[PDB]
Amino acid sequence: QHAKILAIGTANPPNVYHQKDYPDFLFRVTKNEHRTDLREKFDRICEKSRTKKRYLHLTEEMLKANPNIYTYGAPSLDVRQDICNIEVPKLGQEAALKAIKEWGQPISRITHLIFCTASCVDMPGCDFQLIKLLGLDPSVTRTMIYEAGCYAGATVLRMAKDFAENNKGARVLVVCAEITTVFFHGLTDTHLDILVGQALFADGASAVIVGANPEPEIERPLFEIVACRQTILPNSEHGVVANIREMGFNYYLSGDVPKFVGGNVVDFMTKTFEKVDGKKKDWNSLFFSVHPGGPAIVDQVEEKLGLKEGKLRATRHVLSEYGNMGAPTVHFILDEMRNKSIEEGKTTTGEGLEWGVVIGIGPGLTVETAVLRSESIR
Amino acid sequence: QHAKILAIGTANPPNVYHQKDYPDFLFRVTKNEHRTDLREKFDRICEKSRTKKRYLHLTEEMLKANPNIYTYGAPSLDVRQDICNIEVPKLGQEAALKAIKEWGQPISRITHLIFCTASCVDMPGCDFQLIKLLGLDPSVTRTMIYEAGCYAGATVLRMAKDFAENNKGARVLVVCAEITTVFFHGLTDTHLDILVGQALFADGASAVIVGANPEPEIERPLFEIVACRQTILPNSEHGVVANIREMGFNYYLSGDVPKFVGGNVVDFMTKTFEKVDGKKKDWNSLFFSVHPGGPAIVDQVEEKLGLKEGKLRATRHVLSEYGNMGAPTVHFILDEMRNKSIEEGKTTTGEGLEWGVVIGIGPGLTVETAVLRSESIRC
Numbered sequence A: 001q002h003a004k005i006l007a008i009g010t011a012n013p014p015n016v017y018h019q020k021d022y023p024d025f026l027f028r029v030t031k032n033e034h035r036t037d038l039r040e041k042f043d044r045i046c047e048k049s050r051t052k053k054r055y056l057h058l059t060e061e062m063l064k065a066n067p068n069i070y071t072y073g074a075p076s077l078d079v080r081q082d083i084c085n086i087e088v089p090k091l092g093q094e095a096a097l098k099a100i101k102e103w104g105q106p107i108s109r110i111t112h113l114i115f116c117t118a119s120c121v122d123m124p125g126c127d128f129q130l131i132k133l134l135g136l137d138p139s140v141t142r143t144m145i146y147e148a149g150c151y152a153g154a155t156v157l158r159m160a161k162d163f164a165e166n167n168k169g170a171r172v173l174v175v176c177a178e179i180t181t182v183f184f185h186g187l188t189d190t191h192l193d194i195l196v197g198q199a200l201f202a203d204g205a206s207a208v209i210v211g212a213n214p215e216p217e218i219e220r221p222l223f224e225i226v227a228c229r230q231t232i233l234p235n236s237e238h239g240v241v242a243n244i245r246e247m248g249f250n251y252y253l254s255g256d257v258p259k260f261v262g263g264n265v266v267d268f269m270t271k272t273f274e275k276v277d278g279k280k281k282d283w284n285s286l287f288f289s290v291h292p293g294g295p296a297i298v299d300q301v302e303e304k305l306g307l308k309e310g311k312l313r314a315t316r317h318v319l320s321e322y323g324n325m326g327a328p329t330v331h332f333i334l335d336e337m338r339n340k341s342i343e344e345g346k347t348t349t350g351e352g353l354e355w356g357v358v359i360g361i362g363p364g365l366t367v368e369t370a371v372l373r374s375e376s377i378r
Numbered sequence B: 001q002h003a004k005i006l007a008i009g010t011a012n013p014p015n016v017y018h019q020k021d022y023p024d025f026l027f028r029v030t031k032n033e034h035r036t037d038l039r040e041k042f043d044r045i046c047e048k049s050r051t052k053k054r055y056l057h058l059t060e061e062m063l064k065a066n067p068n069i070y071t072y073g074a075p076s077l078d079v080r081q082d083i084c085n086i087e088v089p090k091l092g093q094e095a096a097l098k099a100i101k102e103w104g105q106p107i108s109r110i111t112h113l114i115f116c117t118a119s120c121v122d123m124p125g126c127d128f129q130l131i132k133l134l135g136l137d138p139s140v141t142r143t144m145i146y147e148a149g150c151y152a153g154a155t156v157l158r159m160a161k162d163f164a165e166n167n168k169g170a171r172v173l174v175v176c177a178e179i180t181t182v183f184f185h186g187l188t189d190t191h192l193d194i195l196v197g198q199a200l201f202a203d204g205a206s207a208v209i210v211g212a213n214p215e216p217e218i219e220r221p222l223f224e225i226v227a228c229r230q231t232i233l234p235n236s237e238h239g240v241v242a243n244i245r246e247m248g249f250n251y252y253l254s255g256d257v258p259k260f261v262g263g264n265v266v267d268f269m270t271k272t273f274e275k276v277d278g279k280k281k282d283w284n285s286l287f288f289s290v291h292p293g294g295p296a297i298v299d300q301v302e303e304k305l306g307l308k309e310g311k312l313r314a315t316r317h318v319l320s321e322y323g324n325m326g327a328p329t330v331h332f333i334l335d336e337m338r339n340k341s342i343e344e345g346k347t348t349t350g351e352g353l354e355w356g357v358v359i360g361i362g363p364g365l366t367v368e369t370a371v372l373r374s375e376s377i378r379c
């Protein structure tokens, strides 16, 4: 009786930023049009990004009202927090209402709430704010995951699994929401990492309902969460770093991140599937939701696992249409996979396959995997 | 087969601040000796604090080097974080080594880590840093609880229970560590709440090992974690608020917090025990670890539950000797209770009693309770 995903909902801010237009926007609104060297580099990064558009809360009017946000290193955490501590729970609410609708049960039936964000921090937290917005029972059992980073879309499934399986009848609402206003920085030739985040990072929220023992013909499972594993990739502490500072949430990204992922993927996949089956796996027999931290990460997974053409289509589709939204992204990918599987008349939510995996990748470097089974479409 | 607490260790910074000396220290080092108005108020708060001493990482030299820390509202987050992001995992390490020693198993048997702190935030987090310091397996399954606040000493037991019970053979290291350097603020009559935190808040770390199915040749359970409940007290959102700002971690404390706790304690205790056996009265039959957010909270729990003289001795002892260290405090209280029970020749780690409760109280206001059973002290 494993925990099952019973619903997935998603949301994004309303403002669409097409990648073709973003270099012009960024350099204009941050008053850096004279930095033609930085512009050419940013153009090359955007060309390689495999991201066509992103949704962002941030607007030009907000930058005009708060120019410290684009003035590299200026004190600006307070204004960023004033925005994100409100907008993160609100975007989470939208996704949650969609998940709850799909699930089809009353909000009063939710017993547990997991809220995850790397975009803000406050006491009481986003979980408390979401309880107020949704009218959740005031005695819901909460887990508030602040500042974990991009592996957490897998981690929250692992946590939901344990809560759902160890508490008879529990129904866990899981909400991941990101608003990257807190991570927006201006341009300096001394901190080129910012060009990569400026090209890739995006806003979005996901919500998932998890429960064990779904009610036959009443709840409709989408995926089963079978087993999970979290690990730290050796010698990679510098891979992804983010610090909570007076200037906002500052970050550093090593160019070696993709190679670290590629150098460990066989191992972490093997060790994960050992928790289920003693037989060796054929990686092409699986469906995949891979956190698309950037396009090179996706390429490394494909290469080192020997994946066939098109195996990572759902992952690449989400990166293209939404960018890297952090923890929610792998949930967008599972939703996309389910929806494409319906479109194509596949027999299961996992592209017609039985077994699959979610791969979250973030600071440490830390990788969390969740082994899934699909469910029948009919 | 419920999750058991198999070990408890604790640690504090080395610098001891006796409460009798703290007003003089605070007003001198923050250059506020002219504020005799605030000194009078602070003396009254310290007299009522029921706190005899506290351990603090912060020193006068740090304040002299970083006077923005005591300049109310000045930018200082970065220097605070530079301190706490290092000191929090280090203090946690000290507590963890003590817990691991008691537990008696190799560190390689630890499968899960929960780290909790409200004193800092970073990516990678304190959990990652503690893994490095201790040499935990790189594949430990982690939960990093940042900025939950004062209910979390109960919450982490609830989380550890689910992880330990759902993952067969799991052994969960739980570390809660607080360094209040991030919360230290200077003095203004526009934010009098700071006088309360200045009197009560303190530094410390706890470590607890949690597992189901204890290994008879090695492990010795102290408590069993039976059932847990978390709830929000109505109409109390202003009770405890803390914001992460350029000036550090700012906080507000409503004077009505004790009244909210007293007005809800019978209800939250009753609803908690509904998960066990339906207990509704005769609360003196239990042992207690109550988060001593301040002395008035302790007094309200005692009064409204009708607790007899001495029932909350362990709670009051920890408040007296350590102050309010945040989430770890209820674990210090369980450790004290175990210690005193040994000293007195009690039959169990819970003052001879069978059933007890941990009560954590923090922002929301949120109350998390954990119902415990004690374990035999063998003889």
Ligand SMILES: CC(C)(COP(=O)(O)OP(=O)(O)OC[C@H]1O[C@@H](n2cnc3c(N)ncnc32)[C@H](O)[C@@H]1OP(=O)(O)O)[C@@H](O)C(=O)NCCC(=O)NCCSC(=O)c1ccccc1
Pocket (backbone or CB within 6 Å): A041, A044, A045, A048, A049, A149, A150, A183, A192, A193, A196, A201, A240, A242, A251, A253, A254, A255, A256, A257, A258, A293, A294, A295, A296, A297, A326, A362, A363
């Ligand atoms: C799309 C890129 C960035 C570039 O495409 P490629 O196929 O590699 O093509 P190229 O080799 O032509 O490179 C083009 C130019 O880019 C430059 N450059 C590249 N990397 C860097 C770098 N780190 N730092 C500085 N510069 C860099 C490179 O030098 C070159 O410069 P030139 O043209 O010669 O002047 C790809 O490497 C990728 O997906 N990387 C993974 C991103 C990643 O780690 N994501 C996950 C972590 S996100 C996270 O945890 C988080 C999320 C939210 C908040 C907080 C935290």
Ligand SMILES: CC(C)(COP(=O)(O)OP(=O)(O)OC[C@H]1O[C@@H](n2cnc3c(N)ncnc32)[C@H](O)[C@@H]1OP(=O)(O)O)[C@@H](O)C(=O)NCCC(=O)NCCSC(=O)c1ccccc1
Pocket (backbone or CB within 6 Å): B041, B044, B045, B048, B049, B149, B150, B183, B192, B193, B196, B201, B240, B242, B251, B253, B254, B255, B256, B257, B258, B293, B294, B295, B296, B297, B326, B362, B363
């Ligand atoms: C020990 C006290 C503070 C005072 O003893 P009592 O028996 O009440 O004696 P009195 O009534 O004579 O009061 C003396 C004077 O103090 C004053 N005053 C009192 N309260 C306040 C106040 N809020 N705000 C401003 N002033 C206040 C009061 O007005 C009086 O002033 P005067 O003398 O007339 O000029 C007791 O009320 C207590 O335990 N409170 C619970 C503290 C609490 O909520 N803890 C939990 C949250 S910790 C947390 O979440 C956290 C932890 C770490 C980091 C971040 C967050």
